[PDB]
Each structure stands twice: as structure tokens, then as C-alpha cells.
A and B are shown apart, each in its own frame.
With several copies, the nearest count.
Chain A
């Protein structure tokens, strides 16, 4: 029953980051998750100290609700088109062990097949910009919903154009018609310093997609916590949690 969990694609500078954190803490949010877009052309890996939130923010974000300390997550969104770049991401399962939730973005149907079949990821990114048609096979979706794969739908087409709005709503209606709507969570991107709307109306932005009259909000509020759970069971251990506790 953990609400207020979305995925943000936002890094420009510290000032815009502080503004987005203050805006999210003001409106309705209690967990901020920052994505980092990495494409297949650059192939860069800077994982050790790239962001450093706690050394630069001031000790607490204050919200209007229960006034609880906001947990801040650092996630990685990897755009993967080539199959060799997917093999590079296969090589990163033992070399560098950070970035609690690993989010792959597929473009090839064979690569999307082996992503749901063999490749150990947390949440598959599905965004459609500038004419990307894609078919859906149902038994890997069944293995995905049996495993725990929550499908990410990162949306921000309303700010730039309207054709991008059309392709996103068409791909989302196709996803809701084929995937049947078991675990699909939607999230907003942040390039401009104000690209966030109300938290209760994200439920209707998912209800325009479909998925239920109420289990859209119930499914995002359950499956984002289940996504943090899946990332934690990938990070710590698959059945064990070992934490150093020195009182």
C-alpha cells in the first residue's frame, strides 16, 4: 500500500533537480526515482559517483502529508538496439554491481523475446516515438507476469507535439488490448523544470489507457512497490537480505 512512486528522467543541473524535488514533495510524491538515459551509440559506464544526492541536498525534503523521509532511488534506463549491446549488458551482471533497478529498453523483437525469456532485468522500458511499430507475443508476457516484470510506460508527449501524443496513445491502447493489463506502470519525464501534474490524475491518465476504473491506481501503487521489491531481491540476494546493523 505504498503510493507516490514514479520514475523520472531528469538531470540537467543541481538547481532544476532541487526544483523538481521541491515540486514533487509539494504536490503528492514521497519516493523520487531518477532515470539515466544511456544509448547504444555512446556506451559509457560512469557508475561510482555520478549524482551524489545526499551530499548536495539539505538533509530532508518536506511534504504536506505525513512528513516522512523520502527515499531517493538512482535508476538506469539503457536504450538497447543492437544485439551485441545486449551482450554488453549481459556482461554487466557481475562486473559493476550498483544501480538497484536496471531498466532495459528493447527495439528488436528477438531481443525483446530474450529479454523476457533469459535476460535478467527488472523493468522493461516501452516508449514509442517517431513511428515505432511492434508486435506482442503472449507466452513471454505470461512468463513476465509470472516472474514479476512490470512494464514501464514513460510518457511525456503532451509538451512537444501532438503526433507524439498520437503514437503514444496508439501504442498504449495496443498494450492494453494485447497485454490484458496485469502489471503496467506509467511514469513522467522531466526536461523542463515543471513537467509534472497531480498524482491522483495519473490514475486517470492510466484509465484513458484503460486497465480498470480503479485497478489502474491500485496496480501502479502495488506494482511500483513490487518493482522496488524485485530490484531489492536482485540487489541484496534472491531469497536473503543481509544488512549491517550496528546500534
Chain B
């Protein structure tokens, strides 16, 4: 019994798909736009030293975002905040450094749903209607309360709105450190530095890390084969593990010594002289990822030396809702990630990496 518990499993889900950019059934744009929170956006190009200026201007302008210390939740339900940021664009908000299985974590959706995952104490002290979400077997750990602000903005004199206002203002004042962003889709301009001027708002740019790697042993792929043909093409999952090995700044050969490191490169392969590596780190908007994916699609319009380029996006490992309905849990680790392997004939691979306790979307 215990020996099986020593070696049972952590749960793993790894889903691979292949698709076309010129296909009408392609839902990659919906999958990027309806995915909300993002941390690390990296892209890899083999056999390219000097970056073009058109992509460099897109990389240097992925932000900005804002950080507010100790912001109360009842500021987020005012009609000025709804008519200013929510009704005139895409407003993104998330609490900072509060664990999803331990602490309270509040997120704001562009559809208008403020979704907050609470423990039992905060769910009892606020008194809002929710559903049991995360359990401990027979005991209940974490609840989720969803408040649709767009339906409450139509009737501001309803009993639901004054109930939520009394719960947030006088009943339980909750304050958190918020990361904020607002994609502008409105003719009336109003900055966020002037709105949150009472609290210590800080404007931040995403960190850009550039790398030029030498003598990289990249595998050979076929576009019309996911599982890989024998002795001609490689497997995309071994290529993903090798991708993680390269992004860990680890690229060596067999080293017979006392500290033995056996690592099989995916073969057959091809030596690449220059590998361009870019990593953008911060609160990344998904529309910038949409423009980046369209630029990586249009990069193969000209005859280039790269057979396939890589675009990997790791999201926040501390968010309540990712992949449009799915709950991100923390069972000793686990993350959620999506990768793009873009070929030259407008074909792409959609990978989905799932952590311990999380459901996978199609």
C-alpha cells in the first residue's frame, strides 16, 4: 500500500494538435484571446542572427501594466470603474502573491465577471452566494464566488448590487495587491494613473531577455505527422522536453565522468549555427500575443532559412481560472502552458501542457 504510494503518479495531461492558419475552422485566435493571464512569452528562431525592426518594436511594446498596493474590492464595483474601464475596453486585474489553495485570490474577467476564490472564513464573512469548488475529500477547502458586473450595471438600484456593496464596504473590507491592465477600445481616453491616484500605483514594463545561442542541434520535423516517422522525423514531445532543456541554458554532449549525465538528443537532427532566443516576462496582454502570432505567421512569407519557429507561453501559476473554465490547482507544483510550432506552409502545432489537478480544453 505504502510502496505503491511511493511510486503511483503525479497526474499528467499533454495534448497535441495540428492545424492550418488559412482554415476557417481554426480557433487559435479565440484560444489566445479567451486565455487571460500570462507570465512568460518566449520565441525561438533557428538560423537568424539580426532581428528585424518591425518585430523589435512589437517586443519592446508588449506592456505596460500597473501595480497597486492595498486596493479595496469595493472600488472595483463602482459605476465609474465599470463605465470607464469595463464598458470602454478590456480591463484585467489579479491579486499578487496569494496562493490559490491557501489564500484569497480575486480576478476580473473582460466579460464583466469578478471571480474570487476564497477560503471558508472569507466566504462566511463576506456572505456572498457561490459554489463549493475545491475539496479535501469530505471537507471543503475553497469556494468560488462569481459576480457579473455587466448585468448589475443595467440595474444599479437592485437589491443584489446594494447587497454586494454592503458586503464589500461595511461587512468585510478586503484589500489586496493588484496587477492591472486595460486594453483601450474606446474613443474617450482616460489613463489609469489619474484614476488610482490615491493609492501607490506603479507603472511597469515587461522584462525582455535576448539570447544568441551557438551550435544548437535542432530536430527535423514533418508537418503532416504528429507521432513522427521512424528514422526521418522526431516526436514533438521529446522536442518540447529538449526545448525546455535549451531554455534552461543546458546544451552539451555525452560526458563520461563520475557525475554521469546521459541525455539523448532527438535524432535525426541538424546543426544550427545561430539560434535567436527572446523571452518577455511580466503581465502580458493576449492581444500582443495575437499580433506576435500573426507576425510569426507572416514571417514565412519571404524565403527564410528557418524551417519552423517556436512560440511558448507560460501563464500565471497562481490564477483561479485559466483556459476559459478550468481551475488551476496546486498539488506540490503543476502549471499550464501552450506552445506553437510554426512551419513555413502556414501549418502550426497546438500543444497544451497540464499540471497536477486541472482539466484540459479542446
Chain B 86-119 per-residue mask, 1 if CB under 8 angstroms from chain A, else 0: 0000000000011101110000000000000001
Cβ-defined contact, A1 with B141, below 8 A: yes
Q: Who on chain A is nearest to B4 by CB?
A: A213
A–B pairs, 26, beta carbons within 8 Å: A1-B101, A1-B120, A1-B142, A2-B102, A2-B119, A3-B102, A4-B102, A66-B97, A66-B98, A131-B256, A133-B260, A135-B262, A135-B264, A173-B2, A203-B332, A207-B5, A208-B6, A210-B1, A210-B5, A212-B5, A213-B5, A213-B8, A215-B137, A217-B332, A222-B136, A222-B139
On whether A139 and B230 interact (CB within 8 A), knowing A65-B99, A215-B137, the answer reads yes
B330 → chain A, closest Cβ, in Å? 10
Task: For chain A, residues 215 to 241, give those with C-beta under 8 angstroms from any C-beta of chain B.
Answer: 215, 217-218, 222
Q: How far is the CA of A222 from the CA of B137 in the complex (A)?
A: 12
Cβ-defined contact, B97 with A133, below 8 A: no
By a CB distance below 8 angstroms, the chain B residues around A133 are 254, 256, 260, 262
Q: A66-B98, A213-B8 are in contact. List 11 more A-B contacts (CB 8 A).
A: A2-B119, A66-B97, A131-B256, A139-B230, A173-B2, A200-B332, A207-B5, A210-B5, A212-B5, A217-B332, A218-B141
Instruction: Indicate whether A163 reaches chain B with its CB closer than 8 angstroms.
Output: no
Instruction: Indicate whether A108 reaches chain B with its CB closer than 8 angstroms.
Output: no
A143 → chain B, closest Cβ, in Å? 9
Q: How far is the CA of A144 from the CA of B101 in the complex (A)?
A: 28
Instruction: Indicate whether A92 reaches chain B with its CB closer than 8 angstroms.
Output: no
Q: How far is the CA of A194 from the CA of B36 in the complex (A)?
A: 42
Q: Who on chain B is nearest to A134 by CB?
A: B262
Q: Who on chain A is nearest to B2 by CB?
A: A210
Q: How far is the CA of A228 from the CA of B205 in the complex (A)?
A: 44
Chain B 238-251 per-residue mask, 1 if CB under 8 angstroms from chain A, else 0: 00000000000000
Instruction: Enumerate chain B interface residues (CB-CB to A < 8 A).
Output: 1-2, 5-6, 8, 97-99, 101-103, 119-120, 136-137, 139, 141-142, 230-231, 254, 256, 260, 262, 264, 331-332
7 closest residue pairs by CB, A with B: A1-B119, A139-B230, A218-B136, A3-B102, A210-B2, A1-B141, A213-B5
On whether A139 and B231 interact (CB within 8 A), knowing A1-B141, A210-B2, A222-B136, the answer reads yes
B252 → chain A, closest Cβ, in Å? 15
Cβ-defined contact, B137 with A218, below 8 A: yes
Q: How many residues of chain A are within 8 Å of chain B by beta carbon? A: 24
Task: For chain A, residues 6 to 44, give those with C-beta under 8 angstroms from any C-beta of chain B.
Answer: none
Q: How far is the CA of A3 from the CA of B137 in the complex (A)?
A: 17
Q: How far is the CA of A22 from the CA of B5 in the complex (A)?
A: 34
Instruction: Indicate whether A129 reaches chain B with its CB closer than 8 angstroms.
Output: no
Q: Who on chain B is nearest to A65 by CB?
A: B97
Q: How far is the CA of A203 from the CA of B1 in the complex (A)?
A: 17
By a CB distance below 8 angstroms, the chain A residues around B231 are 139
On whether A66 and B230 interact (CB within 8 A), knowing A133-B262, A135-B262, A210-B2, the answer reads no
Q: How far is the CA of A1 from the CA of B230 in the complex (A)?
A: 35
Instruction: Indicate whether A87 reaches chain B with its CB closer than 8 angstroms.
Output: no
Instruction: Indicate whether A214 reaches chain B with its CB closer than 8 angstroms.
Output: yes
By a CB distance below 8 angstroms, the chain A residues around B264 are 135
By a CB distance below 8 angstroms, the chain A residues around B103 are 66
Chain A 104-137 per-residue mask, 1 if CB under 8 angstroms from chain B, else 0: 0000000000000000000000000001010100
B37 → chain A, closest Cβ, in Å? 18
Q: Who on chain A is nearest to B135 by CB?
A: A218
Q: How far is the CA of A218 from the CA of B137 in the complex (A)?
A: 9
B75 → chain A, closest Cβ, in Å? 20
By a CB distance below 8 angstroms, the chain B residues around A66 are 97-99, 103
Q: How far is the CA of A19 from the CA of B309 in the complex (A)?
A: 50
Task: For chain A, residues 136 to 193, give those with C-beta under 8 angstroms from any C-beta of chain B.
Answer: 139, 173, 176
Q: How far is the CA of A212 from the CA of B2 in the complex (A)?
A: 8
Task: Tell me which of B6, B136, B231, B260 has the highest count of chain A C-beta atoms within 10 A of its own C-beta.
Answer: B136
B141 → chain A, closest Cβ, in Å? 5
Q: How far is the CA of A215 from the CA of B99 in the complex (A)?
A: 18
By a CB distance below 8 angstroms, the chain A residues around B256 are 131, 133
Q: Who on chain A is nearest to B330 by CB?
A: A200
By a CB distance below 8 angstroms, the chain B residues around A3 are 99, 101-102
B3 → chain A, closest Cβ, in Å? 10
A212 → chain B, closest Cβ, in Å? 7
Q: How far is the CA of A212 from the CA of B331 in the complex (A)?
A: 13
By a CB distance below 8 angstroms, the chain B residues around A65 are 97, 99
By a CB distance below 8 angstroms, the chain B residues around A218 are 136-137, 141
Q: How far is the CA of A125 from the CA of B284 in the complex (A)?
A: 50
Q: How far is the CA of A173 from the CA of B331 in the complex (A)?
A: 24
Q: Who on chain A is nearest to B231 by CB?
A: A139
By a CB distance below 8 angstroms, the chain A residues around B139 are 222
Q: How far is the CA of A3 from the CA of B142 in the complex (A)?
A: 13
Q: How far is the CA of A213 from the CA of B7 in the complex (A)?
A: 10
B258 → chain A, closest Cβ, in Å? 10
Q: How far is the CA of A201 from the CA of B99 in the complex (A)?
A: 17
Cβ-defined contact, A1 with B102, below 8 A: yes
Q: How far is the CA of A193 from the CA of B343 in the complex (A)?
A: 57
Task: Tell me which of B8, B139, B254, B256 has the highest count of chain A C-beta atoms within 10 A of its own C-beta.
Answer: B139
Q: Who on chain B is nearest to A204 by CB?
A: B332
Q: How far is the CA of A133 from the CA of B258 in the complex (A)?
A: 12
By a CB distance below 8 angstroms, the chain B residues around A2 are 102, 119
